[PDB]
Amino acid sequence: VDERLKNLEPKMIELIMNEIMDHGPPVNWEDIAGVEFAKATIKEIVVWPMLRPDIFTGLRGPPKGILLFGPPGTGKTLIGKCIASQSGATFFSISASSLTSKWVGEGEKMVRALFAVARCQQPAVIFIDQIDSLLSQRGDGEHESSRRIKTEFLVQLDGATTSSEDRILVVGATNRPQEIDEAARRRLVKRLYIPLPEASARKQIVINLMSKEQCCLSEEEIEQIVQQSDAFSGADMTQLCREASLGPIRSLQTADIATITPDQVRPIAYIDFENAFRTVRPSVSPKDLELYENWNKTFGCGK
Amino acid sequence: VDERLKNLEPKMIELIMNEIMDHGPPVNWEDIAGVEFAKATIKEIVVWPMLRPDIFTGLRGPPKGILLFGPPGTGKTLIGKCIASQSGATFFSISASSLTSKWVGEGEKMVRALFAVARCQQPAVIFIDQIDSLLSQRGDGEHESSRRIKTEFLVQLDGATTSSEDRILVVGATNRPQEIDEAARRRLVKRLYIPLPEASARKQIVINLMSKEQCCLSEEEIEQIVQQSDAFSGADMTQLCREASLGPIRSLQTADIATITPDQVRPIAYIDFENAFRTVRPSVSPKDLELYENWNKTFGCGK
Amino acid sequence: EPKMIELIMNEIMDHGPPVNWEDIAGVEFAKATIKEIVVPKGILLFGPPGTGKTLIGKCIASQSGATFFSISASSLTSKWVGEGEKMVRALFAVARCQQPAVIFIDQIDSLLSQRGDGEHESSRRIKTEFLVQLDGATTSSEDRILVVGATNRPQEIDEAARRRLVKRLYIPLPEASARKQIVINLMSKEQCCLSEEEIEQIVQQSDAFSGADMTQLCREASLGPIRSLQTTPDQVRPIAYIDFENAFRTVRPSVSPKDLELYENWNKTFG
Amino acid sequence: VDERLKNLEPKMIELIMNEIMDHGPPVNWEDIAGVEFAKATIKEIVVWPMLRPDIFTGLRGPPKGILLFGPPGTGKTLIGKCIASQSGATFFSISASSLTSKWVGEGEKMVRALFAVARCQQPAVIFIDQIDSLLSQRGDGEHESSRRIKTEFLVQLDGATTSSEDRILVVGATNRPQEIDEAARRRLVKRLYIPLPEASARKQIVINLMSKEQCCLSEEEIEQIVQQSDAFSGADMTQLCREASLGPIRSLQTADIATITPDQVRPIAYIDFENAFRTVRPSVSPKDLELYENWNKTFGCGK
Amino acid sequence: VDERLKNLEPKMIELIMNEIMDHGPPVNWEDIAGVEFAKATIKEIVVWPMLRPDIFTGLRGPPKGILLFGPPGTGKTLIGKCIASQSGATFFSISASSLTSKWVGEGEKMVRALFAVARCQQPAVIFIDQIDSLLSQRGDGEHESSRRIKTEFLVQLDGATTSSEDRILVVGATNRPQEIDEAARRRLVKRLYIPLPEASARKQIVINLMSKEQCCLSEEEIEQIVQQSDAFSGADMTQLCREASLGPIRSLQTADIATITPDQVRPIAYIDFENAFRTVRPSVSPKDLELYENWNKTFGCGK
Amino acid sequence: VDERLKNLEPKMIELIMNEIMDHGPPVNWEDIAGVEFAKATIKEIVVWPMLRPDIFTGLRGPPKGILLFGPPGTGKTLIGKCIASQSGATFFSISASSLTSKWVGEGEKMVRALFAVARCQQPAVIFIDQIDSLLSQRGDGEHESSRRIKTEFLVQLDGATTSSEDRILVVGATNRPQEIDEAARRRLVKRLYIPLPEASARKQIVINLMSSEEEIEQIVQQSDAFSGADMTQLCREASLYIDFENAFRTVSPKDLELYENWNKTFGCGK
Amino acid sequence: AMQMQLEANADT
Ligand SMILES: Nc1ncnc2c1ncn2[C@@H]1O[C@H](COP(=O)(O)OP(=O)(O)OP(=O)(O)O)[C@@H](O)[C@H]1O
Ligand SMILES: Nc1ncnc2c1ncn2[C@@H]1O[C@H](COP(=O)(O)OP(=O)(O)OP(=O)(O)O)[C@@H](O)[C@H]1O
Ligand SMILES: Nc1ncnc2c1ncn2[C@@H]1O[C@H](COP(=O)(O)OP(=O)(O)OP(=O)(O)O)[C@@H](O)[C@H]1O
Ligand SMILES: Nc1ncnc2c1ncn2[C@@H]1O[C@H](COP(=O)(O)OP(=O)(O)OP(=O)(O)O)[C@@H](O)[C@H]1O
Ligand SMILES: Nc1ncnc2c1ncn2[C@@H]1O[C@H](COP(=O)(O)OP(=O)(O)OP(=O)(O)O)[C@@H](O)[C@H]1O
Ligand SMILES: Nc1ncnc2c1ncn2[C@@H]1O[C@H](COP(=O)(O)OP(=O)(O)O)[C@@H](O)[C@H]1O
Ligand SMILES: [Mg+2]
Ligand SMILES: [Mg+2]
Ligand SMILES: [Mg+2]
Ligand SMILES: [Mg+2]
Ligand SMILES: [Mg+2]
Ligand SMILES: [Mg+2]
């Protein structure tokens, strides 16, 4: 039935349809090592409704919003990508540039068209990265465009016309949750804190990254690597692995570059990691973590 | 009567006509668990004139304009839905996107067309969600479109052409009432404040939402649950009930979901609510309420 | 151009309930000036919301016995380029053709305001057309015409357009005598019984109350008797002071004292 | 390719294309003196992938994002120019003026258009000079334009849409790295510190710059010149050499300069350098250096 | 030049061109009494390249930057005015009001337009009367517009687009050199100190001022006048001369001044000089001077 | 003359024009009374150029600037009003709050527009009360807008663009002269001290405003270290010889010392 | 000390 798109202009519909992400490289929950409660709740949210809609329909229906917060480089976007790949549903990747428009009135109409289009491809997932830019606290002297966009977003997320039983999920990621509007904050019922990787998380990341690249590492070496790598985030671990991957290249003489000799390169060893530790430093200062903890204790839903 | 719509182009009329909200699932006043005074006021405003128009005409005619303000998630949209369901009159669900156009001099045209169409169908109810986006304080520096729209709204609500006996009602809902323009404030004579639910309201909400699901709850357990849920909003209670309803599913072992019969599910017990309380927190900070009271005593219409 | 003139011709005020001067009560000087001039090309009326400016407009429309035009921003704005000035010219031509003519502009600031950055060319063209047409019509003085309007923020009216409107009037809040007159006029229609002391006490209680607020209070008082009855007209109890006491519970001033100084200083300077 | 540029407007594409830096005079790595570690890292980043795309792809794929920091006038823009010359890739010279605009919703669109255009031309290098103007720590109360621009930049540097390969290098140079945003700091994985030139760097600079002057100095004179010129920045040595070359002109009589031919010019001698030292002094106070060192320890990637 | 001005908006170009300063009355070098080292340096900077472009091309090019600093009234603006005429190049008079604007991003665009227009007309001289206002030290928690303007100035002066053999000169004057940004301070290589006039400077100023007005003064009278006037700035000397010149008018019979003629006025003698001394006092306290000296010892380029 | 106003914002020009005040009731020097050296200096500066412009033009022209420093209520505004009424020149009055604005960069534009509009009419007087507020000592750390406004004012008063024959006089009244920036102090070459009225001045003021010799002398002697505002209030309440004594029976000198020192250092007096 | 932006309007 075209009545859903009757009011919207064709050009806005085309622009929204251009935002659907393609079938990127497959990613599964196994690749995302670390947080376990977040993965469990996300699975309960997404997988269960499709397996048996009859059981979970009604009061047991999934919520319409999710929020992810934490320090930079903790796998929030990785979680979003995994949800897109595994959810088996249309995935929209929205951003600030996709909605804002210089012409008056188009800002809210873009949001309306987005929600209308997502209502036809049910089930659908709308992922907004760095949501703090679009739904910041409503100031006293902000421009009218921002106020109208925020109001339209709030109305679309919750309104009289919704009438429930719509399989539309909105997911947001941010590093500054304290700036999110309370009216928009209540919409994102499930708020998840994603801290830095633990010892098990770091070990799993190292094992996963070293499985692809053949190497001879013993248990003691892995334990030492995990012990030394403290306060590192997932991005820091990936950077450390990439830096260690260059050890064989540097070991050989420069003239080898012209000859390459792909088989000549030695397998990665522990000395490579030893050297890589010097040139890699943690990217997150502890002084920024405190705030997150407080927020997680005040508005978080993690036991 | 095309005479009142003589100077309206068909395209403008179509957009107004297609915005009428069709009759959805029924909602009754008893379904709204909360403040009794607001319910009684709304009933006296809407139902009584319809039943006995002869006695409640002339001076005793219902006023035009109602405002609902309070913290997020206090059931304002639920009151709007109930009014739409019980009024038995044309219901218009207006928003910012509806009345804003990029072309010069069309927002005022849209407002005029909306009011003319509403006058054509009487009795009618016009509901505006997040009215602070359209009717806001007229700043010193702003675009001409916003000022023209605000002035058109003011003229249509109150003007020389406007006259009594027009069964058109305008209902607005907002979370930042202090930003509403004073000229717009004058039109909305009835201001209603909807605070957080109290113990009785929480008990009523729990009873209403839980009666639809088979279970056995002791009176002392219900009292304890109500006592624990302190500072929760209307949506917070619903989220808590939803979280509790998922406990039985988690109780069962993995892989049983695919083939478990609906009957073989344990009813909801007190332990479910005890577990739910851990992962559910209030979504409204108390410090935000201080403003509302100050405004309620200054311009509120409630005793 | 029959279609174009049709829109202008269809904006004339239609028949409605009669309005009389005695109803306004509160503002005697403005009424005196208006009645002296009606039977000074531009008259501007300003004041806090709910001061009866639109009531004055309706009274003039009902009493003057002349063609009355209700023109707003929506009517004089068109998306097509160059049609706004043509429509303004048509409006002025039609007003001149039918004499005498009275043109009322509600929310004048929307049509014309102080020049500001980012203003579109169409608005400036319409403003210039309005000014030139007004000057051309007024200079000859061959045909009678009157243009009046209302606006709650007179400080935003541009000086160029301001000079054309020679007459400026301010309507303050109603006075104790005005409040008593409004009370008696509105309540005398319905069967009521109250003493003079009761009305004096009501006037004393109602301080800084605009006309709209007073009307709302009277409506609440008239509704109170229905609240008294449990779930024919003869059953209505006569309205007493208890009804007013109950009404005062849920009625409060709707105009803040913040901007009163601004209005007072502007009126003293240019009013 | 119109396929990837169909969303953007022609004006944005034209403006972005205007920013391409046309090839200029050639600057080689030998011109830059003193920065061995930074030069080696930049070589590994840029030259190696060109020679062997196959070996360096995958986990060895070159990182995207480089930061340069140090005291003013120590050779950051010189390194940028050398990379532009020797990169063999399209070079974009971006600045705050090009991106920022006075219309709502323009900075984000400008950033997206820039990244798309750089994506079309591969390999590409984007050089943002004085990055602290654009990417600074986010704070409450800032104008929404800056926040939107920052978030758009972050969403372009990483995100779900971003994929491997797609050779694009972003290089930034700044004097106040402590004010860079926490999230943006993660993208700039390789952070380099460029200190004041040492004795060898000063010797190389003076020899190379004075070789063209066609003068004659004895080894002891060069050693003494290096020894005296202590705490001089990169530009200080250039200014000293420039002011020393005017000594022969000053010695010549004022009247004869108009008539004297270029041939009758005394060669530069150590006396000119002695005179120059009397009028040239360091332009960088040692007070501000310490902080940089501390930062280099906390976040620097150097050994 | 359409090629390099096409990008710039025509309105900004017109505003920049409006800054061109009329020649006005000529001001010869000899009119500037006192400073000689600064005068000779400015001569070498500006006059020499014009006469013999071939000789000074290459490594002997003009520095392209000057910063005049000293206590108030020493004659910095007078030197700027003298350069405006003697140099013969296009002169730009830029102040804070010219660049600053309330619209987002207009300041950087104005700076870029100014520099482009200056580059079109060569040779050109840009004089900033109060450089400390626009190039103050960058600090944390400052408005983004000022940071953008400062960074744009730095890039324009010493950016990648900047090329050698370009005839653009920037001259700035300020009473508070200690507040100038170090990065911007680097560009202004030639820093000239203008101290209070010496005895010879005061004598020359007095002689030049009194030459036009006929008077009979002996050498010993001039010597004692110079001795009495100490710690007197050029403005103080001018005010002293102005006050002395009115002595004959004051001594004229009351009510006859209206009907008096210049012929009847007596010449100026030493009698009125003491009376003027009684009414003139130094305007610069000795306390501040020390600071300037220290700065001149640290970063000053004088000998 | 509109050519020199080409680049200015028209609304700014309208605001500056609105800032002008229409001529008030006539006033004379004898009316205010109480100052002799100040009267002589100000009249010499202002009246003389008008009566015989040909002789005074050149090296002996007006200085373009006046400062008045003293305790509160000492008749400072009276001097400015008398100059405005008698000088027969367009009078511009500016306060500290006039230039300040919420938006960035509006102060500099306001100052530029004010100076340009005043330059449109060659004879004009710009009186700026509370000059020490907008023009104050420039510290190491302060608001950017204040620095921009101060520098723009200094440039407008003195700059390369500025040319002789301006014929614009800036009069500034202050109560905290030691907060004035030295650069701004340089512009105001003629600095005058306005002290408390003397015995003869106080007697003249009281006799004139009130409308035997021993009673007048006793009243004058009784009143010591009283400002003009105090005398005005006392006489106003008294009018509501015994009554005068009762009213008399109905500032501090410790701080005044600093003024003297300042008047000794930078004052134009003897 | 704050800046503001503008919104375009189409009048064909
Ligand atoms: N939990 C994790 N397990 C494994 N790898 C991880 C994890 N978290 C992050 N990474 C690695 O970090 C890389 C970048 O992290 P990612 O883009 O997911 O961060 P983010 O949470 O979106 O960051 P930001 O807060 O800056 O927006 C991922 O490609 C992956 O390589
Ligand atoms: N007073 C109430 N009685 C019963 N249910 C309520 C009440 N308040 C809230 N709820 C429940 O909370 C849900 C969400 O509340 P709702 O959307 O009506 O809030 P709102 O006042 O419109 O919020 P907002 O301030 O965000 O616009 C409602 O659907 C209903 O399920
Ligand atoms: N002076 C008055 N006398 C009688 N009724 C008055 C008076 N002032 C206001 N009212 C009442 O106010 C209502 C009409 O107000 P009106 O529309 O004229 O006000 P306004 O100042 O133009 O309003 P706004 O600025 O909000 O559009 C009527 O109820 C009228 O009875
Ligand atoms: N390491 C260096 N080796 C050789 N010359 C150098 C070096 N550093 C600076 N110079 C000289 O200094 C001139 C200007 O320095 P450059 O532009 O590289 O400084 P910068 O570090 O980018 O400064 P800023 O912090 O002001 O942006 C260069 O053209 C070159 O002549
Ligand atoms: N060296 C000098 N020789 C002659 N006159 C001078 C000299 N220095 C200052 N003057 C006089 O000073 C007045 C102009 O001073 P000028 O504006 O140049 O000062 P400045 O140092 O730029 O001041 P500011 O610090 O206030 O910007 C003129 O009277 C000029 O004659
Ligand atoms: N010297 C004086 N002679 C006469 N009246 C004075 C004198 N000084 C002050 N006044 C009176 O005081 C009132 C206010 O003085 P004001 O001009 O505000 O002083 P100041 O400028 O020092 O604040 C004036 O109305 C004036 O009549
Ligand atoms: Mg991310
Ligand atoms: Mg709602
Ligand atoms: Mg009205
Ligand atoms: Mg640089
Ligand atoms: Mg100067
Ligand atoms: Mg005063």
Residue numbers in the entry:
A (entry chain C), B (entry chain B), D (entry chain D), E (entry chain E): 372 to 674
C (entry chain A): 380 to 418, 434 to 625, 632 to 671
F (entry chain F): 372 to 582, 589 to 617, 641 to 650, 655 to 674
G (entry chain G): 2 to 13
Quote the study that presented this structure, word for word.
RAD51 recombinase, the central player of several crucial processes in repairing DNA and protecting genome integrity, forms filaments on DNA, which are tightly regulated. FIGNL1 (fidgetin-like 1), an essential gene in mice belonging to the large AAA+ ATPase family, has recently been shown to prevent persistent RAD51 foci formation, prevent replication fork instability and suppress ultra-fine chromosome bridges(17–20). Previous studies have identified three functional domains in FIGNL1: a N-terminal domain containing a largely unstructured region responsible for localization to DNA damage sites and for interactions with other proteins, followed by the RAD51-binding FRBD (FIGNL1 RAD51-binding domain) and AAA+ ATPase domains (18, 19).
To gain insights into the molecular mechanism of FIGNL1-dependent regulation of RAD51, we utilized FIGNL1ΔNE501Q, which forms a stable complex with RAD51 but is defective in filament disassembly, to obtain a structure of FIGNL1 in complex with RAD51, which likely represents an initial engaged state of FIGNL1. Using cryogenic electron microscopy (cryoEM), we determined the structure of the FIGNL1ΔNE501Q -RAD51 complex in the presence of ATP and Mg2+. To improve the resolution of the reconstruction, we focused on the FIGNL1ΔN hexamer for further processing, which was resolved to 2.9Å. The six FIGNL1 AAA+ domains form a spiral hexamer, with chain F at the base of the spiral and chain A at the top. We identify clear density for Mg2+-ATP, bound in the nucleotide binding pocket of chains A, B, C, D and E, in between adjacent protomers. The electron density of chain F is of poorer quality, presumably due to increased flexibility of this subunit. We could fit residues 2-13 of the RAD51 N-terminus, which belong to an unstructured region not observed in previous crystal and cryoEM structures. In this structural model, the highly conserved pore loops encircle the physiochemically conserved hydrophobic/polar amphipathic residue pattern found in the N-terminus of RAD51, via a close network of interactions, which may provide RAD51 sequence preference.
